A paper describes a structure:
N-acetyl glucosamine-binding protein A ([name]) is an adhesin that binds to the chitinaceous surface of zooplankton and breaks its dense crystalline packing thanks to its lytic polysaccharide monooxygenase ([name]) activity, which provides V. cholerae with nutrients. In addition, [name] is an important colonization factor associated with bacterial pathogenicity, allowing the binding to mucins in the host intestine. The oxidative activity of LPMOs depends on a copper ion bound by a histidine brace motif. Here, we report the discovery of a cation-binding site in proximity of the [name] active site, which allows Ca2+, Mg2+, or K+ binding close to its carbohydrate-binding surface.
The crystal structures of the [name]-calcium and [name]-potassium complexes were refined to 1.8 Å and 1.5 Å, respectively, with R/R free values of 0.179/0.228 and 0.164/0.192. In both structures, a cation-binding site was identified close to the copper-binding active site of the [name]. The cation-binding site is formed mainly by the loop located between strands 7 and 8 of the core β-sandwich characteristic of LPMOs. This includes the backbone carbonyl groups of Val186, Thr189, and Ala191 as well as the side chain carboxylate of Asp185. In addition, coordination by the side chain carboxylate of Asp70, located in the L2 region, is key to binding. The coordination geometry for K+ is that of a tetragonal bipyramid, that is, octahedral, whereas Ca2+ coordination is characterized by a distorted pentagonal bipyramid, with the two carboxyl oxygens of Asp70 involved in the interaction. In contrast, monovalent cations appear to confer only small stabilizing or destabilizing effects on [name], with equivalent trends observed for Na+ and K+. The role of K+ remains enigmatic. In terms of protein stability, the presence of a potassium ion in the metal-binding site might be equivalent to that of the lysine residue from loop L2, which occupies the metal-binding site in some [name] LPMOs.
Residue numbers in the entry: 24 to 203
Write the structure that this text describes.
Amino acid sequence: HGYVSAVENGVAEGRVTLCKFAANGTGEKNTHCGAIQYEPQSVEGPDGFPVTGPRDGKIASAESALAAALDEQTADRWVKRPIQAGPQTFEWTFTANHVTKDWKYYITKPNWNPNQPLSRDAFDLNPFCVVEGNMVQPPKRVSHECIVPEREGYQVILAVWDVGDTAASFYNVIDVKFDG
Ligand SMILES: [Cu+2]
Ligand SMILES: [K+]
Ligand SMILES: [K+]
Ligand SMILES: [K+]
Ligand SMILES: [K+]
Ligand SMILES: [K+]
């Protein structure tokens, strides 16, 4: 169990994280998140994305029983955190630091549709960042150095934490705003 955070050097908090913890600087929170607001560490779903894993339109909720509101998608729906292309640090917090296979990060294609559900077609499915977990338990906070692709305006980053000893993964979408 865990979530994408910005407690130390993380560039941007996960969408679910902002349902419970206010954003750095602005103090913004995501609203109307439903039950997952009390358990942001619990966006757990089937592993194997994108070959299997959560179906289109259920990526942000990971098909979770508690997180269906995260699948809502409009250009105005979610708090957007500023980002720039190039090297950035992504950060996870683990309330339970399970044995880990890897972490993978995907970004929306340039002309993705912000008013349609998130789908495989919305994302560049070649991850822009992969961090090996080596099938061991990580520390309860990790920092990943990733090279963020060039984009303009609102984009969504999908951070996938694949747990090594279950058939599940944790899925945290991140709403980001590039210049323009
Ligand atoms: Cu867990
Ligand atoms: K609510
Ligand atoms: K609720
Ligand atoms: K699977
Ligand atoms: K479900
Ligand atoms: K797994």
